[PDB]
Short mmCIF file of C-alpha atoms and ligand atoms in Angstrom, two decimals:
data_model
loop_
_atom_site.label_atom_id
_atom_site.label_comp_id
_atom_site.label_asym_id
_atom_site.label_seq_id
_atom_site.Cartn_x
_atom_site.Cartn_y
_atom_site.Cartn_z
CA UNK A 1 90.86 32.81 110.61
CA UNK A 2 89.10 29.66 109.30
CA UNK A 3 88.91 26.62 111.41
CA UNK A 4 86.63 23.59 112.01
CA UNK A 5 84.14 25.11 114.91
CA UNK A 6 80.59 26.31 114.63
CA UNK A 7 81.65 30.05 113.62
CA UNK A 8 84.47 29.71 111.49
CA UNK A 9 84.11 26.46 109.90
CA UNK A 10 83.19 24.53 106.23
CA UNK A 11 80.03 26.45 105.67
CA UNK A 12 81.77 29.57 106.73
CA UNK A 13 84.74 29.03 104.10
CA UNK A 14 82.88 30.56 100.97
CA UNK A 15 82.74 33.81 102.34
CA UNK A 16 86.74 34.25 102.31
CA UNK A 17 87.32 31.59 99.46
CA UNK A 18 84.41 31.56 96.97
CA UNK A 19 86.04 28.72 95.56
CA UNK A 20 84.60 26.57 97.93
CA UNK A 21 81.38 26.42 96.00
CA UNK A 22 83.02 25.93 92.74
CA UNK A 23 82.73 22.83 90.40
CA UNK A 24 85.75 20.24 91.28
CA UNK A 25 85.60 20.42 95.44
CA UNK A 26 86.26 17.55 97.23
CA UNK A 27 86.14 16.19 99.27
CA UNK A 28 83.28 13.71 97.70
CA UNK A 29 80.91 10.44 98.67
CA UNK A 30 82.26 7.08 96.18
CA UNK A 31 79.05 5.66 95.53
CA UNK A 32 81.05 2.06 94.59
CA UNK A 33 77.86 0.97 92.18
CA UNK A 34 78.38 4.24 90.26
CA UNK A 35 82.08 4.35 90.29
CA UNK A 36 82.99 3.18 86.66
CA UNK A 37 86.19 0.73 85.88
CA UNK A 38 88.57 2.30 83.69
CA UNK A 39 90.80 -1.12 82.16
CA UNK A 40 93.13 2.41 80.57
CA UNK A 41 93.85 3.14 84.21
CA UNK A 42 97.76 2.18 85.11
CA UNK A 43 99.00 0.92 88.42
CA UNK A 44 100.07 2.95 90.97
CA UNK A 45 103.99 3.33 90.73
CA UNK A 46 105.02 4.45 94.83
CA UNK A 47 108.95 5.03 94.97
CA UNK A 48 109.49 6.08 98.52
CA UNK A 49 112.50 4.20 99.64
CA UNK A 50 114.77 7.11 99.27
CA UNK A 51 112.27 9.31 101.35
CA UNK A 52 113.60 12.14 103.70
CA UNK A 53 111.43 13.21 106.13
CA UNK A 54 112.28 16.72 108.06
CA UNK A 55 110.23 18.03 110.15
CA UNK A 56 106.43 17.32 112.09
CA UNK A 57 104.64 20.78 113.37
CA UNK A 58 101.35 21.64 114.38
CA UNK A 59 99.77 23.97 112.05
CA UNK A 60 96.76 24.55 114.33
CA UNK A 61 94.25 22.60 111.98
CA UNK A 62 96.21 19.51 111.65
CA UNK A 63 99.34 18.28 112.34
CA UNK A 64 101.89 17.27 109.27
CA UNK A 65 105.29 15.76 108.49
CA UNK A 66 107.36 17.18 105.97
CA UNK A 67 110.05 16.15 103.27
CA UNK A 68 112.83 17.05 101.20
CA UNK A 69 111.31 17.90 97.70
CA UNK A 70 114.21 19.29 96.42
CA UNK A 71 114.79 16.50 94.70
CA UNK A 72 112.96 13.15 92.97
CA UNK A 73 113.73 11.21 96.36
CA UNK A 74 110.10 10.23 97.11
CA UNK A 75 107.89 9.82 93.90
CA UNK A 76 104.60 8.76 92.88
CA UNK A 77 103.87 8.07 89.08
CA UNK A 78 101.72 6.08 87.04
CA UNK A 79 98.42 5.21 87.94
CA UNK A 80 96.50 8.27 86.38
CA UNK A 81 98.97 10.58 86.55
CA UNK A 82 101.01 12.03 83.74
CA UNK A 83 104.99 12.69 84.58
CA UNK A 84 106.03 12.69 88.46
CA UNK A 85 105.02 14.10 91.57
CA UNK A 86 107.28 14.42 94.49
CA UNK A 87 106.03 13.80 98.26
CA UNK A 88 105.59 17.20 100.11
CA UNK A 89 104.11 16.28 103.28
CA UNK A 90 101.62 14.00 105.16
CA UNK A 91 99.16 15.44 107.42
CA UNK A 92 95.56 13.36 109.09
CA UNK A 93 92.34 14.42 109.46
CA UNK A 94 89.97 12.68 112.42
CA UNK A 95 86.88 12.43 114.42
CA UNK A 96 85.64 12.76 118.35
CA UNK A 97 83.96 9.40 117.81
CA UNK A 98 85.23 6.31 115.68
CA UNK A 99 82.34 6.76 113.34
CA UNK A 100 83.29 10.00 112.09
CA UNK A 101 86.55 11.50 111.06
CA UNK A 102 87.09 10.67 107.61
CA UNK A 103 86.83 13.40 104.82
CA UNK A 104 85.69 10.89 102.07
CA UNK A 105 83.15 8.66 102.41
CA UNK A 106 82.52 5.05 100.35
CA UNK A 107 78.57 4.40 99.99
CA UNK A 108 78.51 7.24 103.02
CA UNK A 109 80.27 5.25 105.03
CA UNK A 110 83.26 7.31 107.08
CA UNK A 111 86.05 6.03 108.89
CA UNK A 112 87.25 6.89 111.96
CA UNK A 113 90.43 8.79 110.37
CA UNK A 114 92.16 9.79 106.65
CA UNK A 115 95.51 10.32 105.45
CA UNK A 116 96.86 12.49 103.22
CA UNK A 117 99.98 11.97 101.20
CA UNK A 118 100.25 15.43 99.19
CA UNK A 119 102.67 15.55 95.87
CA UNK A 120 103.37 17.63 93.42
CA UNK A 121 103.95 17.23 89.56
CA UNK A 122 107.82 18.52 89.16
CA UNK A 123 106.74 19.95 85.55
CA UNK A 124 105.36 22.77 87.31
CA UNK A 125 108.93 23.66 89.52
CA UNK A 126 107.73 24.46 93.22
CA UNK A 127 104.69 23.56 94.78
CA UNK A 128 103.87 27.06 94.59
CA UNK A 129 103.36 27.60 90.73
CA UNK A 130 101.76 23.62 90.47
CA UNK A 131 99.01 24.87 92.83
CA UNK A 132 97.70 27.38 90.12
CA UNK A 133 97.24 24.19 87.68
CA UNK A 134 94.79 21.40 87.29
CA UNK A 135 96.99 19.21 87.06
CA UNK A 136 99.23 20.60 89.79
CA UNK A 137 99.08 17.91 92.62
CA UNK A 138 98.29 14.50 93.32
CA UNK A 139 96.64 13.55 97.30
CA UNK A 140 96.40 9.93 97.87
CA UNK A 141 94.21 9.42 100.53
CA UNK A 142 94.03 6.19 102.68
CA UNK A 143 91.22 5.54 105.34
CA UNK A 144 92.22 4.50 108.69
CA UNK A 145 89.55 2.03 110.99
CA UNK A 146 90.04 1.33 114.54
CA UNK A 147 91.11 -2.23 114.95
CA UNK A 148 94.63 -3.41 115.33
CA UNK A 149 97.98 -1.19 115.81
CA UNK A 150 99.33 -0.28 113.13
CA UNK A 151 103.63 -0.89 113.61
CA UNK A 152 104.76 1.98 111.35
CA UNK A 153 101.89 4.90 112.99
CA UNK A 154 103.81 4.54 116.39
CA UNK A 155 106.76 6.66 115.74
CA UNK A 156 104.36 9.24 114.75
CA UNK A 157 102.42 8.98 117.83
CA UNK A 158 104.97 8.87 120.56
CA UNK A 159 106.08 12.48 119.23
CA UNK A 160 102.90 14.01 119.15
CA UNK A 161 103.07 15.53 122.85
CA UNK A 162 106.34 17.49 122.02
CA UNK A 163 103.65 19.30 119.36
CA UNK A 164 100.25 19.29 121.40
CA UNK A 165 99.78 23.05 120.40
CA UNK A 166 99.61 25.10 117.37
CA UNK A 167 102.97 26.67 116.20
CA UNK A 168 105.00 23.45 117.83
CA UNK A 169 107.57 21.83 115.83
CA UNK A 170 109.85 18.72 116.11
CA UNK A 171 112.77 17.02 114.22
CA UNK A 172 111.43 14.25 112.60
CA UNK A 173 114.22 12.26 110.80
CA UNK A 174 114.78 8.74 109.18
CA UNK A 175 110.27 8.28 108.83
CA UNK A 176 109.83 5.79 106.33
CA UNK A 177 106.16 6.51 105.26
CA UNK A 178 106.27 2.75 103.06
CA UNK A 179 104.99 1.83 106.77
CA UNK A 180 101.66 3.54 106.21
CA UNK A 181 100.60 2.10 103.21
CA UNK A 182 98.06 -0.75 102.79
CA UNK A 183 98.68 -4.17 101.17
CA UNK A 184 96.79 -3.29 97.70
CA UNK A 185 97.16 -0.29 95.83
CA UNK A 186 93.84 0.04 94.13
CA UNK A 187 91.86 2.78 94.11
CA UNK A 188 88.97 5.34 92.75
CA UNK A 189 90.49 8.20 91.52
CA UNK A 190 88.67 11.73 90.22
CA UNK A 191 89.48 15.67 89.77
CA UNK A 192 89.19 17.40 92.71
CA UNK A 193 90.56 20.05 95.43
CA UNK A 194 92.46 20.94 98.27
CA UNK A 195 90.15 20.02 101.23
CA UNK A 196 91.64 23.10 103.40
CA UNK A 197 91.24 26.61 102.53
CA UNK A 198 92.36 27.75 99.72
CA UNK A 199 90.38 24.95 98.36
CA UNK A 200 92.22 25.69 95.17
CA UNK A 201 90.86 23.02 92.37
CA UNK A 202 94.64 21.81 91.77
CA UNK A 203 94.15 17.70 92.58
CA UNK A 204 93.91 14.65 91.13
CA UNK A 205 92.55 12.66 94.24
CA UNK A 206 93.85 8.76 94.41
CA UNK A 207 92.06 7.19 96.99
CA UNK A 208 93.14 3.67 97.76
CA UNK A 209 90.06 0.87 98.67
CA UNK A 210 92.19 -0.80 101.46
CA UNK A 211 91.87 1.00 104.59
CA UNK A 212 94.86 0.79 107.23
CA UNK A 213 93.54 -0.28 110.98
CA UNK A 214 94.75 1.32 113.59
CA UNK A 215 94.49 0.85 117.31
CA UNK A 216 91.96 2.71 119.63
CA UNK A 217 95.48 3.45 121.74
CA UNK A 218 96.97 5.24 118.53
CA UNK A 219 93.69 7.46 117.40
CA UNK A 220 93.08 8.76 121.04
CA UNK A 221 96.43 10.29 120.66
CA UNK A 222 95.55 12.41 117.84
CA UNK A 223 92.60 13.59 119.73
CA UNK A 224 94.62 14.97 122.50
CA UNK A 225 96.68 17.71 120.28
CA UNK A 226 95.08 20.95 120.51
CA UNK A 227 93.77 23.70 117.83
CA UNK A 228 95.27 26.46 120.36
CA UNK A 229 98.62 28.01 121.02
CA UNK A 230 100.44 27.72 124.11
CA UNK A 231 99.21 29.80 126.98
CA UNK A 232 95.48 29.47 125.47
CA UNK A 233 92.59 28.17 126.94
CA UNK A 234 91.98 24.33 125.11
CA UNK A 235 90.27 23.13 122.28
CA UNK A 236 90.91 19.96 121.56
CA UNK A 237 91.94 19.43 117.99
CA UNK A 238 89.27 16.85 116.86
CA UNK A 239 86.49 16.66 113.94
CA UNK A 240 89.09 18.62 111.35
CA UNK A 241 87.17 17.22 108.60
CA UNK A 242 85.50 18.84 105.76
CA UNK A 243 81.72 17.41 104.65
CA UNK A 244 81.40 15.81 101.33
CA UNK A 245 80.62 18.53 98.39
CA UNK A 246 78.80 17.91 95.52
CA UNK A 247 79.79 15.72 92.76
CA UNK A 248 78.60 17.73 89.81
CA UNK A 249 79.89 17.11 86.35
CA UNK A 250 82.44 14.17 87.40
CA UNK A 251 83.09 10.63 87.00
CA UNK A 252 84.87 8.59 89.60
CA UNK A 253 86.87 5.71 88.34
CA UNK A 254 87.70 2.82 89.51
CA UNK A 255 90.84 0.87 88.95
CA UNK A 256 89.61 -2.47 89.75
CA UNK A 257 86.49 -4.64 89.28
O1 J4D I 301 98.90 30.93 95.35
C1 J4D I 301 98.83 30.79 96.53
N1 J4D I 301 99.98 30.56 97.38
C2 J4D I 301 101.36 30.48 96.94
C3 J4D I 301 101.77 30.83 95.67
C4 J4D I 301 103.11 30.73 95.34
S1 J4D I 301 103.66 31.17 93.66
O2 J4D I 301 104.96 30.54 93.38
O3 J4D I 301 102.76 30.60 92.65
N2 J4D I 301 103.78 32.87 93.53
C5 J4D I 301 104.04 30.29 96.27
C6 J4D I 301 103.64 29.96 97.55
N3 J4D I 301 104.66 29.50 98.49
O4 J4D I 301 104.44 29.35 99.64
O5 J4D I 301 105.94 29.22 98.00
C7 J4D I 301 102.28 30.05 97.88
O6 J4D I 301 101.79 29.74 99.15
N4 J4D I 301 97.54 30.84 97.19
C8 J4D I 301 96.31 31.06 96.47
C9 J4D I 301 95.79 32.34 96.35
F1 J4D I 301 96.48 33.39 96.90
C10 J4D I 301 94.61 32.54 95.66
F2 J4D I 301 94.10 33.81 95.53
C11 J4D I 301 93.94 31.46 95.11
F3 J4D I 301 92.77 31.64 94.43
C12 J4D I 301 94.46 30.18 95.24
F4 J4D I 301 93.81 29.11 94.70
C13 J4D I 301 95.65 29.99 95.93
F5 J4D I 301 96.19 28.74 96.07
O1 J4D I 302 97.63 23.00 100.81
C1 J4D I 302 98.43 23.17 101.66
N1 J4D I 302 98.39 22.49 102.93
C2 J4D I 302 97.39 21.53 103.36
C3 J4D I 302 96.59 20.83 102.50
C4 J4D I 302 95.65 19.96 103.05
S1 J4D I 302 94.60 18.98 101.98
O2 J4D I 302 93.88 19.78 101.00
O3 J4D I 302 95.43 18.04 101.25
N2 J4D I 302 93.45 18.22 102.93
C5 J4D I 302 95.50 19.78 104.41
C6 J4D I 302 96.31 20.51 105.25
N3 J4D I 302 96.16 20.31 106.67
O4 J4D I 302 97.25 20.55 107.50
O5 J4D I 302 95.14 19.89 107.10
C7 J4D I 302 97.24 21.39 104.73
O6 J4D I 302 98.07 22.14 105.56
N4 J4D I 302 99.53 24.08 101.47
C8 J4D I 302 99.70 24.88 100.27
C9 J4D I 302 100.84 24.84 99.49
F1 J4D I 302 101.84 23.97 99.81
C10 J4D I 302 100.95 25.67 98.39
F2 J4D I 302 102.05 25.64 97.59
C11 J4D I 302 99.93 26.55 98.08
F3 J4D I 302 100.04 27.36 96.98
C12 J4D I 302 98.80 26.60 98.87
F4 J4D I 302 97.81 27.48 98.56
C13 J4D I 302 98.69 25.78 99.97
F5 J4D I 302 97.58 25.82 100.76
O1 J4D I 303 100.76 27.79 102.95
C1 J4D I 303 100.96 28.13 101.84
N1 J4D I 303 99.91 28.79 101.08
C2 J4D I 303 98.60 29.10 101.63
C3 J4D I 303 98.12 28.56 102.81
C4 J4D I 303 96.87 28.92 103.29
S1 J4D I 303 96.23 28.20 104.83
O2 J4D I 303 97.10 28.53 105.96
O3 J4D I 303 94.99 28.88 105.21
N2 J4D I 303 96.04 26.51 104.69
C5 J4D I 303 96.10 29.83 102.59
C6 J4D I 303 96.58 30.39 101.42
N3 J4D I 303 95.73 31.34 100.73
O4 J4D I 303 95.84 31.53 99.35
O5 J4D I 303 94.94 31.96 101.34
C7 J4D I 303 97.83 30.03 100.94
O6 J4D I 303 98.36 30.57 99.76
N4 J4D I 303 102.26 27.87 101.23
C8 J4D I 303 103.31 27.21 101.99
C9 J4D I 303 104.12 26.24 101.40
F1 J4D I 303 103.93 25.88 100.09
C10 J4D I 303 105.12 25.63 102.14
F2 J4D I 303 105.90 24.67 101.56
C11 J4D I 303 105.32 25.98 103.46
F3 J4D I 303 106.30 25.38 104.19
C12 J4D I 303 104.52 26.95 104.05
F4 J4D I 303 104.72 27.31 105.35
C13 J4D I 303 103.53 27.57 103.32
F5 J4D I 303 102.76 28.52 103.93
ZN1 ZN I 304 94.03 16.62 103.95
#
């Protein structure tokens, strides 16, 4: 399959998803002097207190926790975003070095990590059928810097050697992902795509200007989990980032001044 390494990775991609070169990819550079401020754009509206999270696994590109969508538990609205989208799943993407890692950039500048919180809009009835639509999910994406320990990232971390190989699972009950979030919700936001094949052009990207800092203690955890199965010689599972694709014919807009 597709991965991250010299032979199968992003400029591989095309060749099974021709997609990839298509008009809204992401992920994308913010250049923050051509961003514009929309005064129309809403806040954000995050409702995650009755959040149930199920499961974490290895997927052998990234690792990811999963909810209960079966319901309007965990919901982001407003900002914007017409109608609601429920929470799915959270899953990272990181570097081998704490100046790399990040999938966007901000005036090219990457961080050493991102995070993605993936909804979808419940008009559409699974996540299945809102994947075929434009308007069909909503990522937000926060940026994660090496600095300080981050509280709420720990019970994530501690569990990640029960899943250090692809096709690893573990219960993963009572997360509360309101510990994840930044102070300030503003953010750029602009059209875009899934980041992972099939880069289907399905997102409306939210990505908040406060990074989160986390300790160099928490990110070298994430670097020890493996792209491999089991009983496989190992890769380390770093540097699962896709490069920045071309902006095209889109705006990014701002929420703030
Ligand atoms: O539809 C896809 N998957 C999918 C669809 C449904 S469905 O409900 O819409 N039938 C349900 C589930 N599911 O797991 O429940 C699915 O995983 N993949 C996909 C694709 F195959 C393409 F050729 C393509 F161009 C593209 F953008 C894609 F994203
Ligand atoms: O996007 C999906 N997962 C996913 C997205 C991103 S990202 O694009 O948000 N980056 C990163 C990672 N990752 O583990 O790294 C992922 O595993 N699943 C998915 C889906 F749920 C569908 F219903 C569907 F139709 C389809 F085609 C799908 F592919
Ligand atoms: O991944 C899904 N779709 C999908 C993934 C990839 S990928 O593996 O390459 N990323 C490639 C294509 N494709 O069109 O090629 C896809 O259609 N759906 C999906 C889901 F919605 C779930 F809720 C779930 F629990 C699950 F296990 C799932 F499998
Ligand atoms: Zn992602």
């Amino acid at each position: 399959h597709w991965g991250y390494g010299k032979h199968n990775g992003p400029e591989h991609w095309h060749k099974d998803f021709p997609i990839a070169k298509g008009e809204r990819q992401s992920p994308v550079d913010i250049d923050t002097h051509t961003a514009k401020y929309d005064p129309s754009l809403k806040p954000l509206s995050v409702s995650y207190d009755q959040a149930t999270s199920l499961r974490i696994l290895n997927n052998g590109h990234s690792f990811q926790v999963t909810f209960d969508d079966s319901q309007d538990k965990a919901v982001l609205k407003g900002g914007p975003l017409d109608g609601t989208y429920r929470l799915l799943q959270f899953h990272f993407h990181w570097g081998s070095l704490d100046g790399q890692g990040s999938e966007h950039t901000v005036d090219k500048k990457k961080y050493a990590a991102e995070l993605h919180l993936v909804h979808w809009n419940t008009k559409y009835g699974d996540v299945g059928k809102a994947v075929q639509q434009p308007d069909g999910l909503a990522v937000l994406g926060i940026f994660l810097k090496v600095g300080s320990a981050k509280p709420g990232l720990q019970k994530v971390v501690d569990v990640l050697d029960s899943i250090k190989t692809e096709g690893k699972s573990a219960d993963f009950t009572n997360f509360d992902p309101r510990g994840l979030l930044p102070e300030s919700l503003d953010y750029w936001t602009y059209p875009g795509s899934l980041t992972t094949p099939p880069l289907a052009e399905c997102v409306t990207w939210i990505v908040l200007k406060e990074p989160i800092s986390v300790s160099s203690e928490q990110v070298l955890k994430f670097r020890k989990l493996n792209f491999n199965g089991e009983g496989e010689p190992e890769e380390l599972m770093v540097d699962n980032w896709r490069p920045a694709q071309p902006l095209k014919n889109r705006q990014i807009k701002a929420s703030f001044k």
